[PDB]
């Protein structure tokens, strides 16, 4: 999306220091704890009654890495998020019935997690660039909903 070069490069440099396993696990879990209604989609994962349980759930962790793995691959495609995530939108809409609003939420949690991990390095300008990526990704994921 409308990403400035200094923006494009702030995103890229930071992402190179990200442990996608830990980060996706932490993002998806926080989503389930902070916005409990998102647990509807994951009933078959097991015990999600407490934060601890959610956070210690292996299926949640493995699901987090899959999700963030795909997000990671889309960052190499910022000039075409719509085409990169097209079949994923179709699936989320037609097979999984996931409200796009959930993507927006995951996005903001993700920004909280990156902040938590990187502290000082996650500066206001670096954050503004990640808000744009995150909305762009959500928008692309919602694009084929009908």
């Amino acid at each position: 999306v409308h990403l400035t070069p200094e923006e494009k490069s702030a995103v890229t440099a930071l992402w190179g220091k990200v442990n996608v396993d830990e980060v996706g696990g932490e993002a998806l879990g926080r989503l389930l704890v902070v916005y409990p209604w998102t647990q509807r989609f994951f009933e078959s994962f097991g015990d999600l009654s407490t934060p601890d349980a959610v956070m210690g759930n292996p299926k949640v962790k493995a699901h987090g890495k899959k999700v963030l793995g795909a997000f990671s691959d889309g960052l190499a495609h910022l000039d075409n998020l719509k085409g990169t995530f097209a079949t994923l939108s179709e699936l989320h809409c037609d097979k999984l019935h996931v409200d796009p609003e959930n993507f927006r939420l995951l996005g903001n949690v993700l920004v909280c997690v990156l902040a938590h991990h990187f502290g000082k390095e996650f500066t206001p300008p670096v954050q503004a660039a990640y808000q744009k990526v995150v909305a762009g990704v959500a928008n692309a994921l919602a694009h084929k909903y009908h």
Binding site: P36, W37, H97, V98, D99, E101, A142, H146
Partner: protein, 141 residues
Amino acid sequence: MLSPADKTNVKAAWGKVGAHAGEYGAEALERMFLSFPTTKTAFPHFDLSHGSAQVKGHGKKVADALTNAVAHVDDMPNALSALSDLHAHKLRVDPVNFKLLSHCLLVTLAAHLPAEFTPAVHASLDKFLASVSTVLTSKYR
């Protein structure tokens, strides 16, 4: 918070709806589904074709619940307590969707009550569904 004047306006307007409630609830639903297609993800088990019986049946239920809230306007949180647990604990519909259905209910009301949908009334009805929505969403977390 509703004012005396709001309650009067809502009672009057809802009074003229009368025995058209169900019918108007189904139309709100149809409107919502076509204007805001992401709302359909909350009803994958339904047949959503024009004139669907499930949609008609659901409209009546929604409309009856709103008729109850109007009959209990000074005690809405308790009158809707049950519905509120249902949405928070079983249905788990994203909150964002309540505004969309509220908007559509107003459009439907405006389409059918030319004489009563004055500005002051539109204002009161909008405050009403905002409050209904707030109660039904109060226990989400």
